[PDB]
């Protein structure tokens, strides 16, 4: 069923609808307490606070090689920082993360794509609701196109990540209905 890949395609997007259901369940639980349980939002006028607080500085220090992770063995929450959660995200506006997107693009590095952001990438879609502003539609188009550059660099199409990457692109085209990125055949004459 190389041609009919719709079956697998549904599973990817299908998960997105499911994710929203989970949020509703925790809505009642969070309502039982205010934003103070474990969420500190730096003043709005301090844009620097949002970028650092939300993405933390641990990314800069990196943690995966081994000793880098244990670069602060004292407690736990401190050497872990504040990770993204429903409570943190629930208070964040759709527009707030949108502006923060500009800073992310600045890193550029072409060949760079830091798979670390991917974990974060999913949160952005969950934070987007209602119709996307004209500007919002344009930006999502920008990041998807850049990814294509990585494929050219890859020596072998049968790589190992390519399959996941292929599925990832399909998600954007159907969910947002952006037929512009959709891989249409040939109109079938």
């Amino acid at each position: 069923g190389y041609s009919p890949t719709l079956q697998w395609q549904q599973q990817q997007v299908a998960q997105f609808s499911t994710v929203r259901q989970n949020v509703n369940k925790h809505r009642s639980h969070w309502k039982s307490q205010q934003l103070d349980s474990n969420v500190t939002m730096p003043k709005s006028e301090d844009e620097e606070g949002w970028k650092k607080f939300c993405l933390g500085e641990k990314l800069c220090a990196d943690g995966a090689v081994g000793p880098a992770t244990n670069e602060s063995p004292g407690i736990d929450y401190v050497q872990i920082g504040f990770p993204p959660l429903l409570s943190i995200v629930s208070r964040m506006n759709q527009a707030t993360v949108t502006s923060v997107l500009e800073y992310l693009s600045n890193w550029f590095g072409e060949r760079d794509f830091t798979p670390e952001l991917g974990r974060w990438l999913y949160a952005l879609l969950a934070c987007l609701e209602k119709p996307l502003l004209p500007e919002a539609h344009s930006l999502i188009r920008q990041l998807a196109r850049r990814c294509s550059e990585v494929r050219l660099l890859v020596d072998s199409k049968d790589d190992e990540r390519v399959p996941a990457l292929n599925l990832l692109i399909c998600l954007v085209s159907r969910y947002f209905d952006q037929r512009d990125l959709a891989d249409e055949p040939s109109l079938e004459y």
Binding site: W8, Q12, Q15, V19, N22, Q33, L86, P163, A164, L167
Partner: peptide, 26 residues
């Protein structure tokens, strides 16, 4: 009681979704 409920249901559900999508290759 003290009442400290909040982790009753894996709130990390969002995190789990990350591995499944990427894992989609095995």
């Amino acid at each position: 009681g003290q009442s400290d409920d909040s982790d009753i249901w894996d709130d990390t559900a969002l995190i789990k979704a990350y591995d499944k999508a990427v894992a989609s290759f095995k």
